[PDB]
Design a protein around this nucleic acid. Structure first.
Ligand code: SAM
Ligand code: MG
Ligand code: MG
Ligand code: MG
Ligand code: MG
Ligand code: MG
Ligand code: MG
Length: 336
RNA sequence: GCCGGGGUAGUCUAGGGGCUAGGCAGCGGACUGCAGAUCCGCCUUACGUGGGUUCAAAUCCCACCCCCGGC
């Protein structure tokens, strides 16, 4: 209410933290000053209880509207649930989305008319710091582990530069696999690496795991996807790691390399490469293994039925599907 | 070296004199299942360093240190 307290600049702040504290500060208008006076817009209540909640004198001057700019914009989650409640209650739109670089990717069901998907994309382009909005069009389809997309708003380019854990990376969300949600898992690995380790990243994609191991001596980044290597090379030079990370284009099975730290970032077919990974890792070395399952028992069983190994750590990385998870196990391979 | 835009909670991004940020990650639950997923709870005041204007600084000033692009 225009009914705003009028004190002298001097005890401004002190007096303001009291008005807000007692929840009597009308925060929909700006504070103002004219000379040595301070005009705090208060809510309303006889200056008899105001003459008590504080001890300095004042007055109640009722002034016009100085308007207050809207601070924050609402949230994508906040709005889609109010505008599309029906389809949400139908599980036909996700309030979750991820951001790779400066591009966003939403999940909207095929039922949703082509014209509304665009209205949603156009509503996420407006409500989220980005330059483009897409939509998942399929699951991660084998081989190069790529996922079909669909443009919905903004710039129609699939290239961009994601920045995580102190390093930057070139990514093409259209021809190469990349997950901005796996940065936590890379930080995990980042700490385990050693100044003397030699790291073999069996399926390096664009190199997020490789660059993450910048503390090691040498690093081999292998990938069968030709589009992967390109970015990988660029990623290597962009991070000043040329005489450290060696990119190789090939089927990891055909690579004759050797190392003490091996990363197996291929959750679904990882089990079909244990043989190569053990053939790669030096004795005493460790194998970062990823897989999909409801418990660790099955992975532990494979490895054991193949070498004397010790499970250093074993944790749950993320939910993979209804009641299924992506698991991570760090095996110490001593002998075999 | 000089101009610019910056350093934002673990991480990454918006904001830009008095409002306490949005995501991921993390933690706890849920979903009995072709999903690198979704879904519900909880993380309720963080802005490089030193000093300076102001009743009030993450914001404005100056300086310095590092990023990022320019000549
Ligand atoms: C899960 S992606 C790597 C993702 C990356 N670590 C990330 O999170 O950003 C799998 C990669 O393994 C590669 N790949 C698939 N089969 C392979 C094989 N037999 N040998 C080597 N690389 C392979 C694919 O080309 C793909 O780039
Ligand atoms: Mg910024
Ligand atoms: Mg946060
Ligand atoms: Mg959980
Ligand atoms: Mg700043
Ligand atoms: Mg400063
Ligand atoms: Mg303040």
């Amino acid at each position: 209410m225009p009914l705003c307290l009028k004190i002298n600049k001097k005890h401004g702040e002190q007096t303001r933290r009291i008005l807000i504290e007692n929840n009597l500060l009308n925060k929909d208008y700006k504070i103002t000053s004219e000379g040595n006076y301070l005009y705090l817009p208060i809510k309303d209540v006889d200056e008899d209880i105001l003459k008590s909640i504080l001890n300095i004198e004042f007055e109640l001057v009722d002034k016009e509207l100085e308007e207050k700019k809207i601070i924050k914009k609402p949230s994508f989650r906040e709005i889609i649930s109010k505008k599309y409640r029906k389809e949400i209650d139908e599980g036909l739109i996700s309030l979750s989305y991820d951001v790779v670089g400066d591009l966003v990717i939403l999940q909207i069901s095929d039922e949703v008319d082509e014209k509304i998907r665009k209205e949603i994309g156009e509503l996420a382009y407006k409500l989220i710091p980005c330059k483009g909005v897409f939509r998942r069009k399929s699951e991660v389809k084998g081989e190069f582990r790529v996922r079909e997309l669909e443009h919905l708003a903004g710039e129609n380019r699939t290239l961009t530069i994601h920045k995580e854990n102190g390093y930057r990376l070139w990514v093409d969300i259209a021809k190469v696999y990349f997950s901005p949600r796996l940065g936590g898992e890379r930080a995990r690995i980042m700490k385990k690496v050693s100044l003397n380790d030699v790291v073999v990243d069996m399926f390096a994609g664009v190199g997020p795991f490789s660059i993450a191991c910048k503390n090691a001596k040498k690093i081999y980044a292998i990938d069968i996807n030709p589009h992967a290597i390109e970015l990988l090379k660029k990623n290597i030079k962009l991070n000043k790691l040329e005489h450290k990370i060696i990119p190789i284009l090939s089927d990891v099975r055909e690579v004759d390399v050797k190392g003490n730290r091996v990363i197996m970032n291929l959750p679904k077919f990882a089990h079909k490469f244990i043989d190569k990974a053990l053939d790669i890792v030096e004795e005493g070395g460790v194998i970062h293994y990823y897989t999909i399952g409801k418990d660790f028992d099955k992975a532990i069983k494979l490895f054991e039925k193949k070498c004397d190994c010790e499970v250093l750590e074993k944790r749950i990385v993320k939910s993979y599907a209804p009641r299924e998870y992506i698991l991570a196990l760090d095996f110490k391979i001593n002998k075999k």
